[PDB]
């Protein structure tokens, strides 16, 4: 009975479980808070727990550690990684920063703490449009996702410099126009939730374009949705709105890094206090300054 033992160990450790929307259904059923990365980290800043067990990928647990340095942030598996965030290196930021020294370095939250030390302001897939448009410069260095960069470039009108060149998410890259055509034929009455990390030609056929947190907010606008993101988001939406109907655009659209977290290693995470996520004091200083600047900009 892992559920019973995890709940006991969670109490004995004075811990709180934070799970991303892409986590397995069994993981979400035992989580205290569920949402996207920045929300989960921002919800922990008002909470007294000694330990944070972050059911998510590496950069998410890092962000929680930067915003909660007084807590022990545990990751159940060091293999829970984001393939897109690891594509962006500091050699890529310093390169574009040499040719555009007046362009601010805007980095997606899906990035390493080391990369955030060179960023002037972080952004999520929910506030990227307003933050970039509120910036003083017309040139913006944006990464690592080039598909989100295209969406921000199309909404703000400012020329976006994507960094790196081929930075993208392989999960949301799976969605093609044939998946859009297949959805409209299987569910003709359903609207289309499409994540901004999808390719632009898929974005332009969406009913709404929003992050997983935005999909939850704007789900009330219709009773039937086809979800173009990680498949485990469908379970999250079904638990929140049981009266509505949700369908995955692709069942094979799954994140290996997210699936590295199971109910077993969460139990072992609380038992052995592993694996601790630490961020250099140096790096957490500048990375937090970019996050707090994002929060001051909504
Ligand atoms: N972009 C989000 C998750 C991810 O990229 O893994 C989100 O929840 O908005
Ligand atoms: S889905 Fe794409 S972006 Fe979100 S975590 Fe898995 S890999 Fe990184």
């Amino acid at each position: 009975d892992l559920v019973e033992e995890i709940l006991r160990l969670k109490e004995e450790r004075n811990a709180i479980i934070l799970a991303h929307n892409y986590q397995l259904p069994e993981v979400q059923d035992i989580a205290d808070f569920i949402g996207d990365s920045l929300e989960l980290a921002r919800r922990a800043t008002r909470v007294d727990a000694d330990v944070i067990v972050f059911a998510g990928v590496d950069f998410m647990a890092e962000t929680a550690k930067i915003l909660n340095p007084d807590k022990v942030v545990l990751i159940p598996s060091r293999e829970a990684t984001c393939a897109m965030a690891n594509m962006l290196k500091v050699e890529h930021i310093l390169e574009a920063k040499r040719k555009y020294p007046n362009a601010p370095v805007v980095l997606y939250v899906n990035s390493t703490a080391e990369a955030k030390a060179y960023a002037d302001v972080t952004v999520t897939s929910a506030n990227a449009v307003e933050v970039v448009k509120k910036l003083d410069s017309d040139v913006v260095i944006f990464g690592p996702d080039k598909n989100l960069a295209h969406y921000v470039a199309k909404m703000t009108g400012k020329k976006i410099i994507p960094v790196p060149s081929k930075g993208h998410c392989y999960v949301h890259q799976k969605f093609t126009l044939d998946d859009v055509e297949r959805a409209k034929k299987l569910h003709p009455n359903a609207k289309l939730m499409i994540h901004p990390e999808c390719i632009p030609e898929v974005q332009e056929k969406a009913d709404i374009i929003a992050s997983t947190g935005g999909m939850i907010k704007r789900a009330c606008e219709w009773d039937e949705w086809v979800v173009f993101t990680e498949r485990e988001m469908v379970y999250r939406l079904r638990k929140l709105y049981p009266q509505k109907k949700f369908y995955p655009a692709r069942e094979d659209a799954f994140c290996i890094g997210m699936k590295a977290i199971t109910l077993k290693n969460i139990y072992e995470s609380l038992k052995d206090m592993k694996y601790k996520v630490e961020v250099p004091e140096e790096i957490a200083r500048k990375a937090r300054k970019a996050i707090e600047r994002m929060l001051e900009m909504s």
Side-chain angles (χ1 to χ4, degrees):
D1 199 340
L2 289 178
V3 175
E4 181 191 46
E5 301 160 27
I6 287 176
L7 264 55
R8 283 185 50 250
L9 268 55
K10 193 173 62 63
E11 160 185 0
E12 301 163 8
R13 299 297 200 193
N14 191 37
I16 176 177
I17 295 179
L18 307 183
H20 188 263
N21 291 324
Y22 295 169
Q23 282 296 297
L24 282 176
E26 45 184 326
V27 172
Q28 304 186 29
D29 297 328
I30 54 94
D32 299 315
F33 292 152
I34 304 174
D36 52 57
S37 64
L38 201 275
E39 285 174 5
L40 288 176
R42 193 161 65 171
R43 300 325 165 188
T45 61
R46 31 174 209 81
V47 162
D48 267 65
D50 290 333
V51 185
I52 289 187
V53 178
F54 210 106
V57 288
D58 47 14
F59 77 86
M60 302 183 169
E62 278 189 328
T63 300
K65 183 64 179 185
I66 299 174
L67 299 184
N68 299 270
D70 57 332
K71 297 180 175 61
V72 180
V73 180
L74 299 181
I75 186 69
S77 174
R78 297 201 188 278
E79 280 68 64
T81 61
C82 169
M84 188 194 87
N86 300 332
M87 301 185 64
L88 179 66
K89 310 174 184 298
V90 292
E91 52 195 280
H92 300 154
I93 301 176
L94 291 177
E95 180 166 84
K97 202 166 186 175
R98 277 172 276 182
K99 6 213 142 291
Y100 304 103
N102 283 315
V105 180
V106 178
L107 284 194
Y108 203 3
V109 169
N110 306 28
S111 56
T112 61
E114 175 81 44
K116 300 186 182 306
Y118 292 87
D120 301 319
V121 56
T122 56
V123 288
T124 69
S125 34
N127 55 16
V129 176
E130 50 165 329
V131 168
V132 171
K133 188 160 56 181
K134 282 159 56 181
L135 285 173
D136 207 336
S137 172
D138 59 327
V139 189
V140 171
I141 304 177
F142 192 95
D145 191 87
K146 83 205 207 75
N147 293 321
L148 176 59
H150 177 99
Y151 175 67
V152 176
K154 196 167 59 84
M155 298 297 100
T156 64
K158 302 178 180 180
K159 36 184 170 180
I160 297 298
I161 303 300
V163 51
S165 57
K166 309 173 63 63
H168 74 279
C169 160
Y170 69 94
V171 181
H172 294 87
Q173 189 78 15
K174 298 296 183 180
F175 302 112
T176 67
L177 288 178
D178 182 86
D179 300 312
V180 178
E181 183 87 334
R182 180 180 177 269
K184 285 183 166 60
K185 295 183 178 181
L186 293 177
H187 316 286
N189 294 18
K191 266 60 182 303
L192 264 53
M193 284 178 182
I194 297 192
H195 200 281
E197 289 184 9
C198 295
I199 60 181
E201 58 184 7
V202 166
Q203 298 180 10
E204 59 188 6
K205 292 185 176 59
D207 294 272
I208 61 173
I209 301 179
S211 59
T212 64
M215 292 173 180
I216 294 176
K217 287 176 187 38
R218 306 186 65 177
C220 57
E221 301 179 0
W222 207 254
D223 61 334
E224 198 174 350
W225 297 89
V226 176
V227 198
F228 281 74
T229 188
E230 216 272 0
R231 49 124 175 276
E232 251 47 88
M233 183 64 185
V234 176
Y235 177 82
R236 174 60 175 173
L237 293 170
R238 288 172 177 174
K239 307 308 285 189
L240 292 174
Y241 308 98
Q243 78 279 24
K244 302 177 181 296
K245 300 193 65 58
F246 303 91
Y247 319 101
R250 292 182 62 95
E251 287 280 42
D252 66 335
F254 75 107
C255 170
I256 285 86
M258 285 297 181
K259 298 308 165 296
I261 308 299
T262 63
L263 210 54
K264 175 177 173 57
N265 51 44
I266 288 176
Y267 159 76
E268 296 177 354
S269 188
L270 289 160
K271 183 207 301 183
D272 308 331
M273 294 290 292
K274 65 178 182 179
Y275 299 91
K276 316 214 180 187
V277 175
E278 283 103 342
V279 185
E281 203 50 55
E282 276 232 21
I283 290 171
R285 194 97 65 180
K286 321 239 78 258
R288 193 181 306 110
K289 199 180 78 166
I291 298 181
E292 67 168 343
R293 192 185 183 189
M294 171 186 61
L295 303 183
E296 296 191 302
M297 305 174 63
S298 188

